[PDB]
Design a protein around this ligand. Structure first.
Ligand SMILES: [Mg+2]
Ligand SMILES: [Mg+2]
Ligand SMILES: [Mg+2]
Length: 69
RNA sequence: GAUUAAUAGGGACAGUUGGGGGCAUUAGUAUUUAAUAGUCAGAGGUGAAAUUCUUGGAUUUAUUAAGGACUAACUAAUGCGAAA
């Protein structure tokens, strides 16, 4: 290996809104700020496709409901 | 002084029924393309292959947008229309 391609990558934990569990569900990858590119702002519009893996108690039976965040 | 009133036909009317028609509306993924992000070396296609596309970054992934079509699944020895 020479220079792992993810060298510049920062990770972020997803947080779910009021109906769902406050606990993070997944994590996302983004490139570091370049002085033009602002790290936080490259993520303004991203879209998360999840089950209810997102409601701790009630989740396990509903794999049938997809939620976009 | 006007025959009945055809399980003849025309008309009226009443609750329906239909994927019948004409206008408007309106959705839905899909193909194709574009944009914005990603990532990389292969994608396609075939019996094998080769023409093609690919580092100017394809195929692939996410989110939108444009544009013409088309109405899946439910869908059937079911329906409507004179037939198409
Ligand atoms: Mg469209
Ligand atoms: Mg359309
Ligand atoms: Mg029917």
């Amino acid at each position: 290996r020479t220079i792992d391609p993810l060298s510049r990558k920062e990770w972020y934990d997803f947080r779910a809104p009021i109906p769902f569990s406050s606990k993070s569900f997944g994590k996302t990858l983004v490139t570091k700020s370049s002085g033009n590119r602002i790290a936080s702002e490259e993520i303004k519009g991203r879209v998360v496709e999840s089950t209810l893996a997102d409601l701790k108690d009630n989740s396990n039976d509903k794999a049938w409901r997809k939620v976009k965040l």
